[PDB]
Ligand binder design. Structure first.
Ligand code: MG
Ligand code: MG
Ligand code: MG
Ligand code: MG
Ligand code: MG
Ligand code: MG
Ligand code: MG
Ligand code: MG
Ligand code: MG
Ligand code: MG
Ligand code: MG
Ligand code: MG
Ligand code: MG
Ligand code: MG
Ligand code: MG
Ligand code: MG
Ligand code: MG
Ligand code: MG
Ligand code: MG
Ligand code: MG
Ligand code: MG
Ligand code: MG
Ligand code: MG
Ligand code: MG
Ligand code: MG
Ligand code: MG
Ligand code: MG
Ligand code: MG
Ligand code: MG
Ligand code: MG
Ligand code: MG
Ligand code: MG
Ligand code: MG
Ligand code: MG
Ligand code: MG
Ligand code: MG
Ligand code: MG
Ligand code: MG
Ligand code: MG
Ligand code: MG
Ligand code: MG
Ligand code: MG
Ligand code: MG
Ligand code: MG
Ligand code: MG
Ligand code: MG
Ligand code: MG
Ligand code: MG
Ligand code: MG
Ligand code: MG
Ligand code: MG
Ligand code: MG
Ligand code: MG
Ligand code: MG
Ligand code: MG
Ligand code: MG
Ligand code: MG
Ligand code: MG
Ligand code: MG
Ligand code: MG
Ligand code: MG
Ligand code: MG
Ligand code: MG
Ligand code: MG
Ligand code: MG
Ligand code: MG
Ligand code: MG
Ligand code: MG
Ligand code: MG
Ligand code: MG
Ligand code: MG
Ligand code: MG
Ligand code: MG
Lengths: 46, 393, 159, 240, 122
RNA sequence: UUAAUUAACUAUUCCAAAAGUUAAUAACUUAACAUGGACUAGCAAUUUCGGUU
RNA sequence: CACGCUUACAUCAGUAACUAAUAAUAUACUGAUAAUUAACAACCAAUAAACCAAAACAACACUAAAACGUUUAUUAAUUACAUUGUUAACCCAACACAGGAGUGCACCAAGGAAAGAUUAAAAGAAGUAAAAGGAACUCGGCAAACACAAACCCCGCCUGUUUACCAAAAACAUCACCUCUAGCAUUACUAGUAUUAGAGGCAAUGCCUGCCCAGUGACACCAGUUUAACGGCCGCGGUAUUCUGACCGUGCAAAGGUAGCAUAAUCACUUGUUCUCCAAAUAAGGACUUGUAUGAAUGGCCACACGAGGGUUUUACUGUC
RNA sequence: GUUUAAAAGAACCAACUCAUCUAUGUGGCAAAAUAGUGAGAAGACUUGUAGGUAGAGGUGAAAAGCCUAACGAGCCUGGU
RNA sequence: ACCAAAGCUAGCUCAACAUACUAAACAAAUACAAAAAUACACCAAAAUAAAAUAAAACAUUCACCUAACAUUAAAGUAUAGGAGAUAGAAAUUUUUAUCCUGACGC
């Protein structure tokens, strides 16, 4: 029906999908962290 | 056959050792010096870690054979929550007793005598049932785990209310969760009733023998029923660490030595978690037999001999609405042979105190058809309960 | 790994193709190390062995660039160390057989200073050098005591 | 993520164990079999298919057990039966007329005289008459009854030649095995299982059958009444 | 969306997320579910007697300072062991094998407060 | 898809390789894998849809 | 309360301007200072054995076979006070958004205010009432109504699912019935074993499903078999006075469209012809019927019940007119 | 709650879930809403939390539907 | 008369030289849901570049396309190519050390 509210917050899902451990447990997430570090991001993950 | 372990769920085998470990006279270059895994280096093999100082919590569980009480002969232990397949038959075989249906004549007279009743028996027992089933809890429908012990204590108090008329019930006391252990060798099988029951009434004065000498002698001509495919030890815990010692629930010098009545409660909200009636009868028979054996061996001795003075124990099993009464007279101690005298046991089974109880009023077609209260009430069950309570005095 | 032309025609389609060797699980016995290794070898490996007239001969003759096998380099290092050490664990009950085995491989005898560095990669060599150079830091008490002893000996000899 | 199987239970028990269904999903997580999922919660009753299994190795002779109860099993179409002998009980697949309070024999002895085949009895194929109805037959001695188990289904013994028994499966196919393979006599329980009528589309969901796809597919050459001859006899004897 | 720059503390999670604020543990979990606190794990504050201590938090403003001489290992050795070893060598009883009499410690694992493992917090 | 070129993968079959077996150079078999070259099909890949009117 | 936001909460002070879609002042702006105190909640034993017997007031039962537990034996550092969540008027929707939001209690004892101030133009939205008529309006009784009933057809058996955001259906699924593919073991199928499990078709039930392997597929590695496999089931001419053709001649096919229904949701001719319904009908229903382009599991014919499906009548009702 | 020997993929009708028809709204309260009216409402039912299936794909009671407001095949970066 | 307008700096860009190349901070905590002192393990993986484009279409082909051999010539030569678009060497030759580094760059 009405859209726009597709984001339902939940810290468990947030940290399990985009967390530091989730990023570091895979070689692609390590590349993501390396790219964010090369760009100089203040926050590398959630 | 069909192995019950799935490979993907079992503990995976350790990886194959590196090829550098198969070269004789060659030292492997591993990553043990850097204290971390590093690719390209060999996998170091470590000896089993030896915690030179032992820790109670964080040590491996010692094996069973290391225990000082470990024995080679297997003992068949019957604890509180042991179930029997052929309940009454297995109990009669393991205890070498003869089963009788009706209650003994002494307790039957003590019940049918109207002079031994409480002032308002019908109303008192109805109020006790209603309080146990509905009133004792603030919830709408209390659970069995709450209304079984409540109703047992209510009946116990209704029986205790008779001490003003019989000034002899003060010679008793109650006990909860006392370790009982009675082991005996029967037909080259070492059985042991060992554990703790629900409630135990003890008394200073023993219970008089209730079986007549004619019945005791006719017991010699009775043979025990046998089951061929099933073993008598079906349902018992086969253990190897145990103590062959007649340890009753108390120490020496106990002022209330003689056990009067055991009380077993099936206070479980689930049918599979509760006991069947037959299994409950078997459990109460076995525990009464263990108590009688403990008392007999503490009185006369550990020698196997027919008792010239029998030991009478009583037992009551309560499902919440179904009562099973047992009077067990132990007469012998030698149980290896199946030829001598056997004990006796009168078991009144399936004694309904009340058929049903409505915690809420039923309404069908906008009119109440059955009010709140117990539907159907058999006062003979409480009469037998009071007889079993007053049997000591 | 490469490409190929279907129907062997240049003007036809180009198709990626992976040509793989035929592996075989064979058991090879070594005379110097005295062990039968169940190895995945090829017909070319067996042919090179038959051409060198021996498994140990083939291992000791073919270099690293022709072996292309870390396990082969480890085997070579092991047998070279054994030949350089004259290991009595080869045949403790047959000294004559041990000597006869050690004589026929005399052309590849390499000293011990180089026999333990042939089948090592760069990481393994760095780890070995680190384990060799791993020395605990000596306390400054020892250095100061040595300095004081030197000064005292100098003052004693200068009188 | 990769999931673990629920079948991690090495110790055999008579009590029903809880099982985690998975609708067509392999250990990866993708659908492998369509039309599976969303059924009723079920427990698993471990069945002992090796019928001739003595308690202790000291007495490997034949043994008799007693039937306690014939119960319903949601995992298979047949009915299970609890049989107790000695100090242990076990679940087996009940035969057609197996009731509570029966005796079942389990034997491995073959003799020159054929034995009278009852229902609950389990003898090797070499000891049964030539026209005996059987079920829970084996492929190799001691492997376990992989073959006929379904409700009402039963095979028939045809002949015994050169110490090898030939049976006929419910699929009308011939299966040659050794004569020392244990087999249970009679038909499997619930013979009226094929006559059951699913009353509504919801009973299929109760059983755990998701509806078929709505995509209309034109029939290919595979369709049509293919009258193929009976395949050759499947033999399991290893001839040297 | 949620915030990423703010610190991830225990106040920002569900009930099952209870992260400590940096305090040290003081025990373990017993049998009935309660917490058993170990009296050896709690820090014992060793407080001296400040009754007859004639020293204040501040010094005299007219008191002179000193040149910065950071104490070094060589200076400490010259102050504690150089006279003793010098006297021993002048007397001729110097033993290079045994240096425990001058204050040197061969292995730290014997005494209570070791230096390299740093068994003491402060 | 009954368009033109035909891959990888999955099921067939065949030959070679490998293992072997019989007899005084011949014949014969392939449990799990598995390499090279062909065959028949599924799943499919790349590309295209002449112009005047 | 849970989940979520983090101080937006509380006290004092100020608001010329910044936030409130405007003021008054302030839970929504500014500054300073304080605060949420554990009993509730989080973290809070393993190793073997006895254990088939549902929850639904559970007495006892049904099928779809069902989470929730004790006891026994061996080890479980043992010694006050550990750590963490405690505010709010709050979350997701660009917003102080008429939207979306789990659970337990009650329907007020708790929450709040539709109108910034006037006048009472048109047009617009919502409501109430209306003489006489009562669908004459309109594609259609849409909407509304003091009515809230009874029937006839088409299509789907039915409950159910679908194009989030123009289509809820006659579409899909469906119980049932049919085809094919498989004789079997440690991750699906399946801890199953042909009364089983997969790939599909069509749709409960009732009467049935007629002929054809010529072509293309599939088994058979060629013949041969298969249509509840893909799919097809005929021309030309004369004949019983004047209309048709039971019949015949000739030709091709693998068989030459069987039963049934039929102007239909079925090319055009078509507003086919006829009867009922109306004062009037290209509407609806019943019949006739080559539909030379209907037709039998890409299923054909009727029937109960059902349907916010698509049409047609009878009253009742009313501003639809 | 009511009718029913019924918890019968039965019936009336609440909470709840969908969205039949109409009228407003159409840079609106709203990038799909409001009001009236509707369908289901003990089941093939709604729903909380957590996990899985990822684009040459997943999933699909086939609408070529849905896969973070544009899906005959997501979005971002690079080729560019 | 409001709105407004103008600065010359912060700094950047391209090169040369160059030590020889993941800066400083790292008291404690940091790959438990990162910054949460503290318990009997498991740890690791590789398998070609493709296409957009050009050949006025598109099927074989399409320089560079994150792999060192630089410079002057041979030479756009031999050769390779739906012998089309285009691609393209080698043999053999030349190359004198340091400072003189700043800017017809913003
Ligand atoms: Mg968004
Ligand atoms: Mg099943
Ligand atoms: Mg079943
Ligand atoms: Mg189907
Ligand atoms: Mg379909
Ligand atoms: Mg953000
Ligand atoms: Mg928290
Ligand atoms: Mg919270
Ligand atoms: Mg505490
Ligand atoms: Mg073609
Ligand atoms: Mg191409
Ligand atoms: Mg295409
Ligand atoms: Mg064209
Ligand atoms: Mg044109
Ligand atoms: Mg024209
Ligand atoms: Mg916020
Ligand atoms: Mg303002
Ligand atoms: Mg404020
Ligand atoms: Mg609060
Ligand atoms: Mg007004
Ligand atoms: Mg207002
Ligand atoms: Mg106003
Ligand atoms: Mg007006
Ligand atoms: Mg109006
Ligand atoms: Mg009105
Ligand atoms: Mg009017
Ligand atoms: Mg009209
Ligand atoms: Mg008109
Ligand atoms: Mg209407
Ligand atoms: Mg109406
Ligand atoms: Mg009406
Ligand atoms: Mg329908
Ligand atoms: Mg019906
Ligand atoms: Mg769906
Ligand atoms: Mg729509
Ligand atoms: Mg929907
Ligand atoms: Mg709609
Ligand atoms: Mg609808
Ligand atoms: Mg349909
Ligand atoms: Mg039929
Ligand atoms: Mg259809
Ligand atoms: Mg039909
Ligand atoms: Mg047909
Ligand atoms: Mg054909
Ligand atoms: Mg043919
Ligand atoms: Mg008709
Ligand atoms: Mg027409
Ligand atoms: Mg009309
Ligand atoms: Mg037709
Ligand atoms: Mg048709
Ligand atoms: Mg067809
Ligand atoms: Mg209708
Ligand atoms: Mg419907
Ligand atoms: Mg409808
Ligand atoms: Mg209903
Ligand atoms: Mg609405
Ligand atoms: Mg209205
Ligand atoms: Mg409503
Ligand atoms: Mg309704
Ligand atoms: Mg309805
Ligand atoms: Mg997930
Ligand atoms: Mg494509
Ligand atoms: Mg797809
Ligand atoms: Mg479609
Ligand atoms: Mg379409
Ligand atoms: Mg999108
Ligand atoms: Mg081009
Ligand atoms: Mg161009
Ligand atoms: Mg083009
Ligand atoms: Mg182009
Ligand atoms: Mg390229
Ligand atoms: Mg050429
Ligand atoms: Mg050209």
């Amino acid at each position: 029906k009405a859209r726009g509210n597709e984001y339902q917050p939940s810290n468990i899902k947030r940290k399990h999908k985009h967390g530091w451990v989730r990023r570091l447990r895979t070689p692609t997430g390590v590349q993501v962290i390396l790219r964010r570090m090369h760009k100089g991001r203040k926050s590398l993950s959630h | 056959a069909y192995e019950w372990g799935v490979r993907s769920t079992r503990k995976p085998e350790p990886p194959p050792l590196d090829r550098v470990y198969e070269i004789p006279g060659l030292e492997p270059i591993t990553y043990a010096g850097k204290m971390h895994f590093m690719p390209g280096l060999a996998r170091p093999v470590f000896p089993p870690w030896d915690p030179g100082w032992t820790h109670p919590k964080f040590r491996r569980l010692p094996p069973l054979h290391e225990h000082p009480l470990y024995k080679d002969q297997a003992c068949y232990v019957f604890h509180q929550r042991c179930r029997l397949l052929e309940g009454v038959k297995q109990a009669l075989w393991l205890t070498k007793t003869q089963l009788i249906e009706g209650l003994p004549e002494k307790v039957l007279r003590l019940a049918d005598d109207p002079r031994n009743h409480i002032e308002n028996q019908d109303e008192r027992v109805l109020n006790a049932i209603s309080h146990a089933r509905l009133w004792h809890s603030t919830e709408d429908i209390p659970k069995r785990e709450t209304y079984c012990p409540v109703i047992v204590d209510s009946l116990i108090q209704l029986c205790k209310s008779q001490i003003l008329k019989h000034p002899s019930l003060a010679r008793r006391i109650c006990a909860q969760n006392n370790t009982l252990s009675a082991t005996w060798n029967r037909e080259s099988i070492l059985l042991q009733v060992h554990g703790s029951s629900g409630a135990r009434l003890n008394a200073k004065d023993p219970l008089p023998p209730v079986a007549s000498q004619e019945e005791v002698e006719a017991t010699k001509n009775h043979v025990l029923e046998t089951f061929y495919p099933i073993s008598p030890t079906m349902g018992l815990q086969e253990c190897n660490v145990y103590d062959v010692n007649d340890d009753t629930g108390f120490q020496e010098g106990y002022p209330y030595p003689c056990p009067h009545t055991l009380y077993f409660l099936e206070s479980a909200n689930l049918r599979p978690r509760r006991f069947q009636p037959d299994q409950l009868r078997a459990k109460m028979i076995l525990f009464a037999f263990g108590s009688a054996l403990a008392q007999a061996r503490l009185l006369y001795g550990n020698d196997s001999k027919v008792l010239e003075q029998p030991v009478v124990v009583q037992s009551v099993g309560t499902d919440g609405r179904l009562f099973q009464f047992l009077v067990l007279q132990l007469n012998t101690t030698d149980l290896a042979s199946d030829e001598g005298v056997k004990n006796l046991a009168w078991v009144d089974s399936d004694q309904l105190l009340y058929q049903h109880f409505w915690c809420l009023p039923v309404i069908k077609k906008k009119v109440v058809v059955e009010p709140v209260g117990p539907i159907g009430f058999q006062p003979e069950t409480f009469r037998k309960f009071l007889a079993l309570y007053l049997h000591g005095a | 790994l490469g490409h190929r032309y279907v129907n062997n025609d240049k003007l036809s389609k180009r198709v990626r193709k992976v040509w793989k060797p035929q592996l075989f699980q064979r058991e090879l016995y070594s005379e110097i190390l005295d062990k039968r290794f169940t190895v995945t070898v090829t017909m070319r490996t067996l042919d090179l062995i038959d051409q060198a007239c021996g498994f140990d001969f083939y291992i000791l003759k073919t270099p690293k660039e022709d072996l292309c096998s870390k396990f082969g380099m480890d085997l070579k290092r092991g047998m070279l160390l054994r030949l350089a050490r004259q290991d009595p664990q080869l045949h403790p009950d047959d000294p004559a057989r041990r000597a006869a085995i050690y004589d026929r491989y005399k052309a590849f005898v390499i000293p011990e200073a180089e026999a333990e560095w042939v089948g090592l990669t760069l990481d393994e060599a760095v780890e070995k050098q680190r384990l060799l150079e791993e020395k605990d830091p000596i306390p400054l008490f020892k250095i100061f005591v040595e300095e004081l002893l030197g000064q005292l000996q100098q003052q004693a000899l200068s009188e | 993520a990769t999931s673990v199987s629920w079948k991690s239970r090495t110790k055999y028990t008579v009590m029903p164990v809880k099982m985690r269904k998975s609708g067509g999903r392999n250990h990866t997580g993708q659908i492998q079999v369509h039309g599976i999922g969303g059924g009723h919660k079920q427990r698993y009753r471990m069945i002992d298919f090796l019928r001739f299994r003595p308690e202790h190795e000291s007495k490997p002779g034949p043994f008799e057990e007693k039937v306690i109860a014939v119960r319903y099993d949601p995992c298979r179409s047949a009915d299970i039966a609890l049989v107790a002998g000695g100090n242990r009980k076990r679940w087996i697949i009940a035969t057609e007329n197996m009731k509570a309070g029966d005796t079942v024999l389990n034997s491995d002895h073959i003799g020159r005289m054929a034995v009278a085949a009852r229902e609950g009895d389990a003898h090797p194929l070499g000891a049964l008459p030539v026209g005996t109805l059987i079920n829970n037959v084996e492929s190799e001695p001691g492997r376990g009854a992989q073959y006929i188990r379904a409700a009402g289904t039963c095979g028939v013994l045809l002949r015994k030649v050169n110490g090898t028994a030939i049976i006929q499966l419910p699929s009308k196919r011939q299966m040659q095995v050794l004569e020392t393979c244990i087999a249970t006599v009679g038909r499997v329980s619930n013979v009226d299982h094929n006559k059951r009528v699913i009353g509504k589309a919801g009973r299929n969901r109760w059983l755990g059958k998701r509806p078929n796809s709505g995509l209309w597919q034109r029939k290919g050459g595979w369709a049509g009444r293919k009258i193929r001859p009976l395949p050759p006899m499947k033999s399991y004897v290893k001839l040297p | 969306g949620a915030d990423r720059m703010s610190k991830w503390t225990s106040k920002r999670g569900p009930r099952t997320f209870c992260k400590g604020r940096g305090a040290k543990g003081t025990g373990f979990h017993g049998r009935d579910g309660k917490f058993v606190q170990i009296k050896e794990m709690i820090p014992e504050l060793v407080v001296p007697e400040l009754a007859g201590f004639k020293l204040k938090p501040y010094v005299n403003y007219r008191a002179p300072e000193g040149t910065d001489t950071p104490l070094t290992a060589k200076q400490l050795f010259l102050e504690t062991a150089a006279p003793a070893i010098e006297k021993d060598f002048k007397a001729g009883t110097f033993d290079p094998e045994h240096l425990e009499k001058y204050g040197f410690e061969p292995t730290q694992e014997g005494k209570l407060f070791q230096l390299y493992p740093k068994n003491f917090p402060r």
